């Protein structure tokens, strides 16, 4: 369809490909929604091939693509208002990923990213996360927002809020974390979990629709692997790193105490004292302003200095009077 | 333990004026300035632009350079000490006219527009801001000692005089007082223009210096001395 | 001795007046001005704000007249906005009035060299680095950069090493003219500084640091 | 709380003052108690507001600009609360669409071979089809 | 510990009729800053609005401010009295002709 309708073959083909760029994007997300566990290899061959095509279109038709991207963000928001998580699907997770491929995420303001980043952060805060599927959906979202900020490294409070409850969800309370509000107390891991076997931390998207302990542990390890990355990249720079990490130290401390063999919290933990040791936590000083100079006003003057008509009329009468009086005398 | 100031918004320091005598400041007097006008329109006489006219007047054209006072004013008014509001400049023309320069003035950078300003000043006796809320350059009454601060130290820049460090000189000097330096904007002449006012004369560099360099060299000591930065 | 670009061992204090707005134009060739020629620069399609060779003249008057130059510890370079690099002999005594200066530069830009009867002013080949000393600190003047004491900066600097400063002679512009040559940018005062003042300050500090007096 | 002037560094300060300042930095500890119930005993006035500094790096451009106000002089007498109170995620998205200033959409020069990880460059390691 | 003053705090600045009026100034002479509002007009508006002229502009409560705005926007409704609310070139040419005539005689 691209080849048959290149811009040169006929007039109007730029607009036709411009609309086809939007139509292609709706196809990429549409296929992901459709069930594909039977032929994952075949789906993986088509889905990435279409994305590679979509990237070429964006270089020429980003404006048409941008408009479709912003409309979809409105559509996800509208469906979320009525159905909440039931509206959300695998297509949305794929969609948020494609935007990162095709658009510059590391911008303070962007037409498509900023609505996406607000919408994504809404899910990390508003959604209940009362099921393993729902937590796995959130675990993907943390990875996307983390990749959006892979250079900017901006602070997303929702990621802090998300990590706290998910870590506390799998320990259910211990009676020591009353400030964290959980949405499901029946997802706690059993004490018999090994935490020594090699369990894959990758979350395949087709598994979410199917969504026991092994899946719970694999989701948990993925969340903590994101937590380790966030600490070492983003939070360490912030002046409030100690305040940001303090609740998480207690949660990771619980994991080590409850599961001695489990090593991931200890590696995240041991890293954390190392950061807090080096970092100097001095009072901030922000109101130090440069001295303001005395004002500067330009001079008023004439370029060619000279040391209405009714006044001029009166002026000429005075001279004419003086001549007349001398003439008369 | 000391409590902070109520308002930390930075405020422009007060603009020094001859009326105020208490505050410590830097007075710089550009004595023997060559500023005079003549009908051709009125033009500020120059050593190069107008050579015949100054011959007709009988006055030497070596001493007909207002560009020196232009150069001295730019370096003085653009200095950080002025920006801190701790410097006010006077000009004593060779004819006997005293000009008080508001620290806030922004004199034109090019000399051609500077000359047009002085004929306005020398005839209208004042210059007003573009927004017209103060007088930027006003001709005042002689002698200069009346306008100077009540407690003030006077000195002239004499090549023959002993060389001193401007840094050490201001530091050893008292705190309620203030300092006047009578710089000679003349190209060449005896350093007796300000003898009757001053108490002593000091040299700053063993080599001869231009007027702009001599005043700039003096103020930079005052800034480091007073931590103006 | 008169310091020259050929010598690279002696510790000296180079000043580069970057973004110098010196150009000649013929209607006869004449140095361009923001005030003498306004319509003409409109015809060339440039802004008249950045048409000020007086800034480069004032910087040279204060640089050449400084006590350090009398001591033979300073040599100046001018990087025109067009990329023309000019080497100024420390011994030169440029004209004091600007009109005589404009006549001198217009001779320079066409004849490419001024000779006296050593070239007092000579046009040279870019980049600046080839002419600068082998061991040298490069800095720029930035309002946004941290403020430093020039006396302390030069003192902590090495003895065999020299100091280059790229002073921006533009009226207004971004302080990135010399960014690729330079390794750091330093602020000199909390208040914004004129080009003439900035080099005079940096001149005064060297004299205290090196005891030129 | 927004700034302690004792911790500021002055270029003119003497070497002993530099040494004295360094020791003061090493011994500082935040005294704010989060568990104390009496607001008059929490020692908050002796603490500092690091948390508001971090908000200057908030991902939302307009929230970051608001947070930057604490770094600017306090010229404004007060802020109208009613203009900030009743905001929702929906309002932020709607406000984003009804933006007065319209910008151009940019693109990423960096290229990723695959969007998702397997079960050269992967945009989302840890996620698979 | 909890004391809330009914009247309100002192307003350093106020916005009336799309104009900024300083609180430190008295009500009449602060309202004078509004274009078209003179000394006597502001005094009369304050008298109609029943505001004590000794108060500062900041001291004003809300209802007095809406009352002042209402009086100003509709002066007639509150009985504010109505009373309160080439040839020269030809003469010059004639003069020039006459002057030329005198120069002719002399």
């Amino acid at each position: 369809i691209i080849k048959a309708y290149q811009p040169k073959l006929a007039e109007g083909n730029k607009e036709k490909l411009g609309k086809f760029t939007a139509v292609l994007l709706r196809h990429i997300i549409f296929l992901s929604n459709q069930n594909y566990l039977k032929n994952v290899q075949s789906f993986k061959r088509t889905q990435n091939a279409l994305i590679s095509i979509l990237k070429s279109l964006s270089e020429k038709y980003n404006r048409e693509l941008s408009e479709e991207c912003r409309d979809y963000i409105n559509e996800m928001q509208a469906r979320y208002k009525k159905n909440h998580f039931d509206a959300l699907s695998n297509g949305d997770l794929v969609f948020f990923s494609i935007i990162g491929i095709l658009f510059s995420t590391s911008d303070q303001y962007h037409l498509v990213i900023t609505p996406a980043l607000i919408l994504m952060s809404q899910f990390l805060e508003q959604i209940k996360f009362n099921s393993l599927k729902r937590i796995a959906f959130g675990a993907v979202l943390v990875r996307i927002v983390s990749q959006y900020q892979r250079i900017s490294k901006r602070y997303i409070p929702e990621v802090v809020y998300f990590f706290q409850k998910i870590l506390l969800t799998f320990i259910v309370k211990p009676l020591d974390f009353e400030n964290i509000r959980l949405d499901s107390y029946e997802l706690g891991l059993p004490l018999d979990v090994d935490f020594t076997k090699k369990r894959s931390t990758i979350i395949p998207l087709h598994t979410l629709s199917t969504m026991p302990v092994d899946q719970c542990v694999s989701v948990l390890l993925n969340v903590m692997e994101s937590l380790d990355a966030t600490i070492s990249t983003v939070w360490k720079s912030l002046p409030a790193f100690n305040e940001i990490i303090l609740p998480i130290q207690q949660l990771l401390s619980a994991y080590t105490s409850k599961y001695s063999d489990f090593e991931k919290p200890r590696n995240i933990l041991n890293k954390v004292e190392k950061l807090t040791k080096f970092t100097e936590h001095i009072p901030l000083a922000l109101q130090n302003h440069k001295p303001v100079s005395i004002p500067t006003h330009a001079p008023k003057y004439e370029e060619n200095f000279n040391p209405k008509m009714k006044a001029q009329l009166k002026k000429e009468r005075k001279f004419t009077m003086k001549e007349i009086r001398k003439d008369a005398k | 333990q000391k409590a902070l100031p109520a308002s930390l918004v930075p405020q422009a320091p007060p603009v020094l004026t001859s009326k105020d005598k208490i505050t410590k400041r830097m007075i710089v007097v550009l004595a023997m300035a060559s500023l005079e006008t003549h009908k051709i329109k009125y033009v500020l006489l120059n050593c190069d632009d107008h050579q015949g006219l100054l011959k007709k007047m009988g006055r030497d054209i070596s001493e007909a350079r207002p560009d020196i006072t232009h150069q001295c004013l730019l370096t003085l008014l653009d200095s950080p000490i002025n920006k801190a509001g701790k410097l006010q400049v006077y000009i004593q023309t060779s004819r006997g006219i005293l000009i008080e320069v508001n620290p806030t003035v922004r004199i034109p950078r090019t000399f051609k527009r500077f000359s047009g300003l002085m004929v306005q000043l020398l005839h209208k006796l004042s210059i007003r801001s573009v927004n017209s809320e103060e007088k930027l350059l006003k001709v005042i009454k002689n002698p200069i000692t009346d306008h100077l601060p009540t407690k003030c130290r006077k000195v002239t820049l004499s090549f023959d005089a002993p060389v001193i460090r401007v840094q050490d000189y201001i530091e050893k000097l008292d705190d309620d007082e203030s300092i006047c330096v009578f710089v000679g904007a003349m190209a060449r002449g005896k350093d007796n223009f300000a003898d009757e006012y001053v108490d002593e004369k000091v040299g700053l560099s063993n080599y001869p210096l231009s007027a702009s360099v001599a005043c700039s060299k003096f103020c930079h000591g005052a800034e480091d001395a007073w931590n103006i930065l | 001795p008169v310091l020259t670009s050929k010598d690279k061992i002696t510790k000296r204090m180079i000043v580069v007046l970057a973004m110098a707005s010196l150009e000649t134009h013929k209607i006869k060739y004449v140095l361009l001005n923001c005030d003498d020629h306004q319509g003409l620069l409109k015809k060339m399609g440039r802004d008249i704000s950045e048409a000020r060779p007086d800034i480069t003249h004032q910087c040279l008057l204060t640089l050449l007249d400084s006590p350090i130059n009398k001591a033979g510890k300073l040599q100046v370079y001018i990087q025109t906005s067009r990329g023309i690099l000019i080497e100024v002999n420390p011994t030169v005594r440029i004209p004091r009035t600007f009109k005589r200066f404009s006549g001198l530069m217009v001779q320079l830009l066409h004849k490419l060299s001024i000779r006296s009867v050593e070239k007092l002013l000579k046009v040279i080949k870019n980049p600046i680095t080839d002419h600068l000393p082998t061991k040298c600190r490069k800095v720029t003047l930035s309002f946004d950069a941290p403020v430093i004491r020039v006396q302390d900066y030069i003192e902590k600097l090495d003895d065999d090493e020299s100091i280059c400063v790229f002073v921006g002679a533009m009226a207004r512009g971004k302080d990135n003219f010399a960014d690729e040559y330079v390794d750091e940018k330093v602020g000199l005062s909390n208040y914004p500084l004129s080009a003439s003042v900035a080099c005079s300050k940096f001149c005064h500090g060297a004299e205290d640091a090196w005891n030129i007096l | 709380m927004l700034h302690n002037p004792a911790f500021i560094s002055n270029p003119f300060q003497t070497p002993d003052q530099v040494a004295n300042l360094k020791t003061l930095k090493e011994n500082y500890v935040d005294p704010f108690d989060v568990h104390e119930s009496d607001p008059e005993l929490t020692h908050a006035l002796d603490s500092s507001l690091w948390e508001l500094a971090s908000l200057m790096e908030h991902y939302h451009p307009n929230v970051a600009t608001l947070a930057k106000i604490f770094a600017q002089p306090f010229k404004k007498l007060s802020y109208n609360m009613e203009d900030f109170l009743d905001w929702n995620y929906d309002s932020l998205l709607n406000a984003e669409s009804s933006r007065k200033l319209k910008t151009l959409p940019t693109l990423e020069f960096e290229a990723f071979t695959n969007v998702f990880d397997n079960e050269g460059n992967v945009y989302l390691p840890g996620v698979a089809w | 510990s909890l004391v809330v003053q009914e009247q309100g705090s002192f307003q350093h600045i106020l916005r009336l009729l799309n104009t900024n009026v300083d609180g430190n100034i008295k009500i009449v002479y602060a309202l004078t800053t509004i274009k078209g509002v003179g000394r006597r007009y502001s005094n009369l508006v304050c008298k109609k609005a029943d505001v004590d002229l000794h108060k500062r502009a900041g001291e004003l409560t809300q209802e007095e401010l809406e009352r002042i705005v209402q009086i100003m926007q509709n002066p007639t409704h509150y009985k504010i009295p109505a009373w309160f609310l080439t040839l020269a070139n030809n003469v010059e040419s004639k003069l020039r002709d006459d002057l030329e005539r005198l120069k002719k005689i002399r």
């Binding site: 330009a298 | 950078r109 | 207004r172 004129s194 | 109208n80 009743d86 | 106020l14 916005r15």
Partner: peptide
């Protein structure tokens, strides 16, 4: 409650340099 306090703060609200080598404006 928002409308009531929205009215009050309207009166509270208040609606609404040469440097370096900048030359004074030409004319």
């Amino acid at each position: 409650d928002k409308k009531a306090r929205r009215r009050t703060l309207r009166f509270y609200t208040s609606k609404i340099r040469f440097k370096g080598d900048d030359d004074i404006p030409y004319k």
